Amino acid sequence: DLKSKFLEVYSVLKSELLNDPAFDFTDDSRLWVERMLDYNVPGGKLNRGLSVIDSFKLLKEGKEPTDEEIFLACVLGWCIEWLQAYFLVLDDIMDSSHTRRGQPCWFRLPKVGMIAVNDGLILRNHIPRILKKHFKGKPYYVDLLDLFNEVEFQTASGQMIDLITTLVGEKDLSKYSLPLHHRIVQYKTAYYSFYLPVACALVMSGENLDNHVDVKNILVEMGTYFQVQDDYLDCFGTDIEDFKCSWLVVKALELANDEQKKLLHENYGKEDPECVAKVKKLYETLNLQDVFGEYERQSHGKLIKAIEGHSNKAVQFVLKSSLEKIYQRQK
Amino acid sequence: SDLKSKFLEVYSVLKSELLNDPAFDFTDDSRLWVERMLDYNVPGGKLNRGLSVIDSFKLLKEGKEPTDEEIFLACVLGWCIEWLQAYFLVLDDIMDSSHTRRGQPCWFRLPKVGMIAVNDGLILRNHIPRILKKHFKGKPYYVDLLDLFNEVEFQTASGQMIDLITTLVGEKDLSKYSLPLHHRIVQYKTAYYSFYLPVACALVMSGENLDNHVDVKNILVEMGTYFQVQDDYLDCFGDPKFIGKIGTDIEDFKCSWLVVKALELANDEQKKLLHENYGKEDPECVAKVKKLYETLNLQDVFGEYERQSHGKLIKAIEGHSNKAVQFVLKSSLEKIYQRQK
């Protein structure tokens, strides 16, 4: 129903981009861009993109959204998926990764290499082209541009602190802390994964985003909790191997004794299954599955009370639906 | 100079504002990181594109003295152009596996940076909206600024794409290289951001609608194409002391204007000579290619191209109905006509 229409809208947007009047395409560059698009953009699960349409429908009370609206919401969802693909291509380059969704990373294919860097740029610059094409006549056009620019800035800044914390500070693991993890996760994932889709739906609904700081705070907290879920599922996956500032290692560094904190310092993300076995058993000995369960339900309580504090029924429906889609997930 | 010093003072102001940005939770580490990256990559060049914004705005302000506030806003737009260029240059140095820029190691070459520089490029680009929002959000031409910068960035990235896939992908047949492909690469990769964008910023500040200045855009794009032809010529026949570096376009198998004109002017033996020497590093082949350029008299062909381009541009410029616009375009032309650096 909606998902099929979303993929159809992908085909529409790709056609428009490959007939863009701002660039003089030839067969070579048109085929290059179309292969790059098909390899990097539509292959994911597209949850963030479709949540735009979901949120827009719930904010239109319990009524029917029209046809234009459905198309527009799909276009904004695809803008979010384009943003994510743009970040992922460059992240795979920076992480020297090999595989994504079971296929080689874009930059790993022999005819691309570091060209993929520029491809990342292309992906990002497709978002204005799309927006201009479908929202230039709308009165909230500039709000869209400001929203996407600010969320992109925040995601890049979160990636920066993740990079510097890890690669520039794996001397002392003491560095990893609970506020540092919270900040990294809030800026790198929460704004674009949870705030941005609902903010798109709100802007389309005619709302001023400056009157919805409550919604933004709640969604940022919910995204932090989502990424904690991700950190937990990576181990219970190469976070330990990659010396990442995971929630699990941070909680372990706060709950262990001097001997177990010595164990962590002397076996964290330093190659070999050996080293990765010791970390997992330290996690078991501290019973980090019960700490994560307690954190999980406690966060759930926080979020539901905060959500029921809001004065708009549709907003409550949106936030409650977002929460239950991830509550006690295994994937 | 007076205005260059004021321009660098405006850089300091913009950097302070960016390091106190309310949209991000800075700590000592990331604030020092962003400041070390900004100072290393943004203010160290010649800032010609940035300062041309102020020059163009003052030329368009026929008759009525610009305020200090207007000069500051023009400086801000010039710095946005320099930020865009810095972002592109950081990523280009990564893609080209370069080693040094302006006599110092490339940002990604420093041991504590490496591939972090990729994300640093992103940071640089996303500084441009932060700056614009900070200083122009209340202006009625704010959205025109955003559209201008987004579209020029799209066109620059696309020009880089066709340059990369022309040079790197496929086999390395030198036949593909042609004059239309060179024109397309050069127009989209350099001309829009180096020549159109500064003047367009000055025009937007003047209250103009850019949709009524397509002629200006055409003239500036053609002028930027001519500028990059000059750069291609000087990369081989220029002076390394005056330019700053030694040109390696022949080694790097670039779709230069010189090799294209050589392939259109040579005979079968000289085109085979070109096929068997262009694009390898060792100076024997480079010297054969350069002396072929000499025997083909590519210097005099370039001189004739330059004076034909000058005549064309002068005629097109004097076709325009606004004298201030004509002054802007002629000032842009005479700064580069017969330049040596």
Numbering used by the authors:
A (entry chain B): 3 to 238, 248 to 342
B (entry chain A): 2 to 342
Give the authors' words.
Prenyltransferases, also known as isoprenyl diphosphate synthases, catalyze the sequential condensation of a basic five-carbon building block (C5), the isopentenyl diphosphate (IPP), to synthesize prenyl precursors of isoprenoid metabolites and isoprene polymers, collectively called polyisoprene. Ultrahigh molecular weight cis-1,4-polyisoprene and trans-1,4-polyisoprene (TPI), which are the principal components of natural rubber and gutta-percha, respectively, are also isoprenoid metabolites that are assumed to be synthesized by specialized prenyltransferases. These prenyltransferases are divided into two major groups, the cis-1,4-prenyltransferases (CPTs) and trans-1,4-prenyltransferases (TPTs), based on the stereochemistry of the double bond formed during IPP condensation. To investigate the molecular properties of the EuTPT proteins, we determined the three-dimensional structures of EuTPT3 and EuFPS1 using X-ray crystallography. Similar to EuFPS1 and other prenyltransferases, the EuTPT3 subunits were composed of 10 core helices (α1-α10) with a deep pocket that included two DDxxD motifs responsible for substrates binding.
